[PDB]
Coordinates of all heavy atoms in Angstrom, one line a residue:
Chain A
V94 N -18.2 30.0 -26.1 CA -17.0 30.6 -25.5 C -17.4 31.1 -24.2 O -16.6 30.9 -23.2 CB -16.4 31.7 -26.4 CG1 -16.1 31.1 -27.9 CG2 -17.3 32.9 -26.5
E95 N -18.5 31.8 -24.0 CA -18.9 32.3 -22.7 C -19.2 31.1 -21.8 O -19.1 31.2 -20.5 CB -20.2 33.1 -22.8 CG -19.9 34.5 -23.5 CD -19.5 35.5 -22.5 OE1 -19.9 35.6 -21.4 OE2 -18.6 36.4 -23.0
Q96 N -19.6 30.0 -22.3 CA -20.0 28.8 -21.5 C -18.7 28.0 -21.0 O -18.5 28.0 -19.8 CB -20.9 27.8 -22.3 CG -21.3 26.7 -21.5 CD -20.4 25.5 -21.4 OE1 -19.6 25.4 -22.3 NE2 -20.5 24.7 -20.4
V97 N -17.9 27.5 -21.9 CA -16.6 26.8 -21.5 C -15.8 27.7 -20.7 O -15.1 27.3 -19.7 CB -16.0 26.2 -22.7 CG1 -15.5 27.3 -23.6 CG2 -14.8 25.3 -22.3
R98 N -15.7 29.0 -21.0 CA -14.9 29.9 -20.2 C -15.6 30.0 -18.8 O -14.8 30.0 -17.8 CB -15.0 31.3 -20.8 CG -14.5 32.4 -19.9 CD -14.0 33.6 -20.7 NE -14.6 33.7 -22.0 CZ -15.9 34.0 -22.2 NH1 -16.7 34.4 -21.2 NH2 -16.4 34.1 -23.4
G99 N -16.8 30.0 -18.7 CA -17.4 29.9 -17.3 C -17.1 28.6 -16.6 O -17.0 28.5 -15.5
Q100 N -17.1 27.4 -17.5 CA -16.6 26.2 -17.0 C -15.2 26.3 -16.5 O -14.9 25.9 -15.3 CB -16.7 25.1 -18.0 CG -18.1 24.8 -18.5 CD -19.0 24.2 -17.4 OE1 -18.5 23.3 -16.6 NE2 -20.3 24.6 -17.3
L101 N -14.3 26.8 -17.3 CA -12.9 26.9 -16.9 C -12.7 27.7 -15.7 O -11.9 27.5 -14.8 CB -12.1 27.5 -18.0 CG -10.7 28.0 -17.7 CD1 -9.8 27.0 -17.0 CD2 -10.0 28.5 -18.9
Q102 N -13.6 28.8 -15.6 CA -13.6 29.6 -14.3 C -14.0 28.7 -13.1 O -13.3 28.7 -12.1 CB -14.6 30.7 -14.5 CG -14.7 31.6 -13.2 CD -15.7 31.0 -12.2 OE1 -16.8 30.4 -12.6 NE2 -15.5 31.2 -10.9
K103 N -15.0 27.8 -13.3 CA -15.3 26.9 -12.2 C -14.3 25.8 -12.0 O -14.0 25.4 -11.0 CB -16.8 26.4 -12.4 CG -17.8 27.5 -12.5 CD -18.0 28.2 -11.2 CE -19.1 29.2 -11.2 NZ -18.8 30.4 -12.1
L104 N -13.9 25.3 -13.2 CA -12.8 24.3 -13.1 C -11.6 24.9 -12.5 O -10.7 24.1 -12.0 CB -12.5 23.8 -14.6 CG -13.7 23.1 -15.4 CD1 -13.3 22.9 -16.7 CD2 -14.2 21.9 -14.6
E105 N -11.4 26.2 -12.5 CA -10.4 26.8 -11.7 C -10.7 27.0 -10.3 O -9.8 26.8 -9.4 CB -10.0 28.2 -12.4 CG -8.8 28.9 -11.8 CD -8.3 30.1 -12.6 OE1 -9.1 30.4 -13.6 OE2 -7.3 30.7 -12.3
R106 N -11.9 27.4 -10.0 CA -12.3 27.5 -8.6 C -12.2 26.3 -7.8 O -11.9 26.4 -6.6 CB -13.8 28.1 -8.6 CG -14.3 28.3 -7.1 CD -13.6 29.5 -6.4 NE -13.3 29.3 -5.1 CZ -13.1 30.2 -4.2 NH1 -13.0 31.5 -4.4 NH2 -12.8 29.9 -2.9
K107 N -12.4 25.1 -8.5 CA -12.3 23.9 -7.7 C -10.8 23.6 -7.3 O -10.6 23.2 -6.1 CB -12.8 22.8 -8.6 CG -11.9 22.5 -9.9 CD -12.5 21.4 -10.7 CE -12.3 20.0 -10.1 NZ -12.8 19.0 -10.9
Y108 N -9.9 23.9 -8.2 CA -8.5 23.5 -7.8 C -8.0 24.5 -6.7 O -7.4 23.9 -5.7 CB -7.6 23.7 -9.1 CG -6.1 23.3 -8.8 CD1 -5.8 22.5 -7.7 CD2 -5.1 23.7 -9.7 CE1 -4.4 22.1 -7.6 CE2 -3.8 23.3 -9.6 CZ -3.5 22.6 -8.5 OH -2.2 22.2 -8.3
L109 N -8.1 25.7 -6.8 CA -7.7 26.6 -5.7 C -8.3 26.2 -4.4 O -7.6 26.2 -3.3 CB -8.0 28.1 -6.0 CG -9.5 28.5 -6.2 CD1 -10.0 29.0 -4.8 CD2 -9.6 29.5 -7.2
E110 N -9.6 25.9 -4.4 CA -10.3 25.4 -3.2 C -9.7 24.0 -2.8 O -9.5 23.6 -1.7 CB -11.8 25.4 -3.3 CG -12.5 25.0 -2.0 CD -12.3 25.9 -1.0 OE1 -12.0 27.1 -1.2 OE2 -12.4 25.5 0.3
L111 N -9.5 23.2 -3.9 CA -9.0 21.8 -3.7 C -7.6 21.9 -3.0 O -7.3 21.2 -2.1 CB -8.9 21.1 -5.0 CG -8.3 19.7 -5.0 CD1 -9.1 18.7 -4.1 CD2 -8.1 19.1 -6.4
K112 N -6.7 22.8 -3.5 CA -5.4 22.9 -3.0 C -5.4 23.5 -1.6 O -4.7 23.2 -0.7 CB -4.5 23.7 -4.0 CG -3.0 23.7 -3.6 CD -2.1 23.8 -4.8 CE -2.6 25.0 -5.7 NZ -1.5 25.5 -6.7
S113 N -6.3 24.6 -1.4 CA -6.4 25.1 -0.1 C -6.8 24.2 1.0 O -6.3 24.1 2.0 CB -7.3 26.4 -0.2 OG -7.4 27.1 1.0
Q114 N -7.8 23.4 0.6 CA -8.3 22.4 1.6 C -7.3 21.3 1.8 O -7.1 20.7 2.9 CB -9.6 21.8 1.1 CG -10.7 22.9 0.9 CD -11.8 22.9 2.0 OE1 -11.4 22.6 3.1 NE2 -12.9 23.4 1.6
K115 N -6.5 20.9 0.7 CA -5.5 19.9 0.9 C -4.6 20.3 2.0 O -4.2 19.5 2.9 CB -4.8 19.6 -0.4 CG -3.5 19.0 -0.3 CD -2.8 18.7 -1.7 CE -2.2 19.9 -2.2 NZ -1.1 20.5 -1.6
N116 N -4.0 21.6 1.9 CA -3.1 22.0 2.9 C -3.7 22.0 4.3 O -3.1 21.6 5.3 CB -2.5 23.4 2.6 CG -1.9 23.4 1.2 OD1 -2.3 24.0 0.2 ND2 -0.7 22.8 1.2
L117 N -5.0 22.5 4.4 CA -5.7 22.4 5.6 C -6.0 20.9 6.0 O -5.9 20.5 7.1 CB -7.0 23.1 5.5 CG -7.9 23.2 6.8 CD1 -7.2 23.9 7.9 CD2 -9.3 23.8 6.4
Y118 N -6.2 20.1 4.9 CA -6.4 18.7 5.2 C -5.2 18.1 5.8 O -5.2 17.3 6.8 CB -6.8 17.9 3.9 CG -7.1 16.5 4.1 CD1 -8.3 16.0 4.5 CD2 -6.1 15.6 3.7 CE1 -8.5 14.7 4.6 CE2 -6.3 14.2 3.8 CZ -7.5 13.8 4.4 OH -7.8 12.4 4.5
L119 N -4.0 18.3 5.1 CA -2.7 17.8 5.6 C -2.4 18.5 7.0 O -1.8 17.9 7.9 CB -1.6 18.1 4.7 CG -1.8 17.4 3.3 CD1 -0.8 17.9 2.3 CD2 -1.7 15.9 3.5
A120 N -2.8 19.7 7.2 CA -2.6 20.4 8.5 C -3.3 19.6 9.5 O -2.7 19.4 10.7 CB -3.2 21.8 8.4
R121 N -4.5 19.2 9.3 CA -5.2 18.3 10.3 C -4.5 17.0 10.4 O -4.4 16.4 11.5 CB -6.6 18.2 9.9 CG -7.4 19.4 9.8 CD -7.9 20.0 11.2 NE -8.7 21.1 11.1 CZ -8.9 22.1 12.0 NH1 -8.2 22.1 13.1 NH2 -9.8 23.0 11.7
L122 N -3.9 16.5 9.3 CA -3.3 15.2 9.3 C -2.1 15.3 10.2 O -1.8 14.4 11.0 CB -2.9 14.8 7.9 CG -2.3 13.4 7.7 CD1 -2.5 12.9 6.3 CD2 -0.8 13.4 8.0
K123 N -1.4 16.4 10.1 CA -0.2 16.6 11.0 C -0.7 16.7 12.5 O -0.1 16.1 13.4 CB 0.5 17.9 10.7 CG 1.1 17.9 9.3 CD 2.2 17.0 9.0 CE 1.7 15.7 8.3 NZ 2.8 14.8 8.1
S124 N -1.8 17.3 12.7 CA -2.4 17.2 14.0 C -2.8 15.9 14.4 O -2.7 15.5 15.6 CB -3.7 18.1 14.1 OG -4.5 17.9 15.2
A125 N -3.2 15.0 13.4 CA -3.6 13.7 13.7 C -2.4 12.9 14.1 O -2.4 12.0 15.0 CB -4.3 13.0 12.5
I126 N -1.2 13.2 13.5 CA 0.0 12.4 13.8 C 0.4 12.8 15.2 O 0.7 11.9 16.0 CB 1.2 12.9 12.8 CG1 1.0 12.2 11.5 CG2 2.6 12.6 13.4 CD1 1.8 13.0 10.4
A127 N 0.2 14.0 15.7 CA 0.4 14.4 17.1 C -0.5 13.5 18.0 O -0.1 13.0 19.0 CB 0.2 15.8 17.3
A128 N -1.8 13.4 17.5 CA -2.7 12.6 18.2 C -2.2 11.2 18.2 O -2.4 10.4 19.1 CB -4.1 12.7 17.7
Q129 N -1.6 10.7 17.1 CA -0.9 9.5 17.1 C 0.4 9.4 17.9 O 0.7 8.4 18.4 CB -0.6 9.1 15.6 CG 0.0 7.7 15.4 CD 0.3 7.3 14.0 OE1 -0.2 8.0 13.1 NE2 0.9 6.2 13.8
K130 N 1.2 10.5 18.0 CA 2.4 10.5 18.7 C 2.1 10.5 20.2 O 2.8 9.9 21.0 CB 3.3 11.7 18.2 CG 3.8 11.5 16.9 CD 4.8 10.4 16.8 CE 5.4 10.3 15.4 NZ 6.2 9.0 15.3
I131 N 1.1 11.3 20.7 CA 0.8 11.2 22.1 C 0.5 9.9 22.5 O 0.4 9.6 23.8 CB -0.4 12.2 22.4 CG1 -1.6 11.8 21.6 CG2 0.0 13.7 22.1 CD1 -2.9 12.5 22.0
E132 N 0.1 8.9 21.6 CA -0.1 7.6 22.0 C 1.3 6.9 22.2 O 1.3 6.0 23.0 CB -0.8 6.9 20.8 CG -2.2 7.3 20.5 CD -2.8 6.6 19.4 OE1 -2.1 5.8 18.7 OE2 -4.0 6.8 19.1
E133 N 2.4 7.3 21.6 CA 3.7 6.7 21.8 C 4.1 7.0 23.3 O 4.6 6.1 24.0 CB 4.7 7.2 20.9 CG 6.0 6.5 20.9 CD 6.9 6.9 19.7 OE1 6.5 7.7 18.9 OE2 8.0 6.4 19.6
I134 N 3.9 8.3 23.8 CA 4.2 8.6 25.2 C 3.1 7.9 26.1 O 3.4 7.5 27.1 CB 4.1 10.1 25.3 CG1 2.7 10.7 25.1 CG2 5.1 10.7 24.4 CD1 2.7 12.2 25.3
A135 N 1.8 7.8 25.6 CA 1.0 6.9 26.3 C 1.5 5.5 26.3 O 1.3 4.7 27.2 CB -0.4 6.9 25.6
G136 N 2.2 5.1 25.2 CA 3.0 3.9 25.2 C 4.1 3.9 26.3 O 4.5 2.9 26.9
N137 N 4.7 5.2 26.5 CA 5.6 5.4 27.5 C 4.9 5.3 28.9 O 5.5 4.9 29.8 CB 6.4 6.6 27.4 CG 7.3 6.6 26.1 OD1 7.8 5.6 25.8 ND2 7.4 7.8 25.5
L138 N 3.6 5.7 28.9 CA 2.8 5.5 30.1 C 2.6 4.0 30.4 O 2.6 3.6 31.5 CB 1.4 6.2 30.0 CG 1.3 7.6 30.4 CD1 1.6 7.8 31.8 CD2 2.2 8.6 29.6
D139 N 2.6 3.2 29.3 CA 2.7 1.7 29.5 C 4.1 1.4 30.0 O 4.1 0.5 31.0 CB 2.4 1.0 28.2 CG 2.3 -0.5 28.4 OD1 1.4 -1.0 28.9 OD2 3.3 -1.2 28.0
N140 N 5.1 2.0 29.6 CA 6.4 1.9 30.2 C 6.4 2.5 31.6 O 7.1 2.1 32.5 CB 7.5 2.5 29.3 CG 8.9 2.3 29.9 OD1 9.5 3.2 30.5 ND2 9.4 1.1 29.7
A141 N 5.5 3.5 31.8 CA 5.3 4.0 33.1 C 4.4 3.0 33.9 O 4.6 2.8 35.1 CB 4.6 5.4 33.1
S142 N 3.5 2.3 33.2 CA 2.9 1.1 33.9 C 4.0 0.0 34.1 O 4.0 -0.7 35.1 CB 1.8 0.6 33.0 OG 1.0 -0.3 33.7
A143 N 4.9 -0.2 33.1 CA 6.0 -1.1 33.4 C 7.0 -0.4 34.4 O 7.7 -1.0 35.1 CB 6.7 -1.4 32.1
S144 N 6.9 0.9 34.5 CA 7.5 1.6 35.6 C 6.8 1.4 36.9 O 7.3 1.2 37.9 CB 7.7 3.1 35.3 OG 8.6 3.7 36.3
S145 N 5.4 1.3 36.8 CA 4.6 0.9 37.9 C 4.9 -0.6 38.2 O 4.7 -1.1 39.3 CB 3.1 1.0 37.6 OG 2.6 0.1 36.7
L146 N 5.3 -1.3 37.2 CA 5.8 -2.7 37.4 C 7.0 -2.8 38.2 O 7.0 -3.6 39.2 CB 6.0 -3.4 36.0 CG 6.3 -4.9 36.0 CD1 5.2 -5.7 36.6 CD2 6.7 -5.3 34.6
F147 N 8.0 -2.0 37.9 CA 9.2 -2.0 38.8 C 9.1 -0.8 39.8 O 10.0 -0.6 40.5 CB 10.5 -2.0 38.1 CG 10.8 -0.7 37.3 CD1 11.2 0.4 37.9 CD2 10.4 -0.7 35.9 CE1 11.4 1.6 37.1 CE2 10.7 0.5 35.2 CZ 11.2 1.6 35.8
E148 N 8.0 -0.1 39.8 CA 7.6 0.6 41.0 C 7.1 -0.4 42.1 O 7.3 -0.1 43.3 CB 6.5 1.6 40.7 CG 6.1 2.6 41.9 CD 5.2 2.0 42.9 OE1 4.3 1.1 42.5 OE2 5.3 2.4 44.1
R149 N 6.5 -1.4 41.7 CA 6.1 -2.5 42.7 C 7.3 -3.3 43.2 O 7.4 -3.6 44.4 CB 5.1 -3.4 42.0 CG 3.7 -2.8 41.8 CD 2.8 -3.7 41.0 NE 1.4 -3.0 40.8 CZ 1.2 -2.0 40.0 NH1 2.2 -1.6 39.2 NH2 0.0 -1.6 39.9
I150 N 8.3 -3.6 42.4 CA 9.5 -4.2 42.9 C 10.2 -3.1 43.7 O 10.8 -3.5 44.7 CB 10.3 -4.7 41.7 CG1 11.3 -5.8 42.2 CG2 11.1 -3.5 41.1 CD1 10.6 -7.1 42.5
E151 N 10.2 -1.9 43.3 CA 10.6 -0.8 44.2 C 9.9 -0.8 45.5 O 10.5 -0.7 46.5 CB 10.5 0.6 43.5 CG 10.6 1.7 44.4 CD 11.3 2.9 43.7 OE1 11.3 3.0 42.5 OE2 11.8 3.8 44.4

Side-chain angles (χ1 to χ4, degrees):
Chain A
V94 303
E95 294 271 323
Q96 184 275 332
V97 63
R98 167 156 27 71
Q100 295 293 320
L101 164 56
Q102 178 274 328
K103 302 290 186 293
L104 301 172
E105 187 169 3
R106 179 72 222 195
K107 63 183 288 182
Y108 182 18
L109 65 93
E110 184 65 26
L111 178 62
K112 189 149 52 157
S113 184
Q114 304 255 26
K115 162 177 76 68
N116 298 113
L117 185 64
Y118 182 80
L119 298 171
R121 301 282 190 207
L122 188 153
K123 302 292 100 178
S124 165
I126 285 160
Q129 184 177 350
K130 290 289 182 191
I131 59 171
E132 293 179 354
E133 189 167 0
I134 67 177
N137 295 325
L138 273 298
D139 186 74
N140 185 257
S142 196
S144 194
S145 78
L146 182 62
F147 66 84
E148 189 276 331
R149 283 174 182 76
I150 204 72
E151 168 145 18

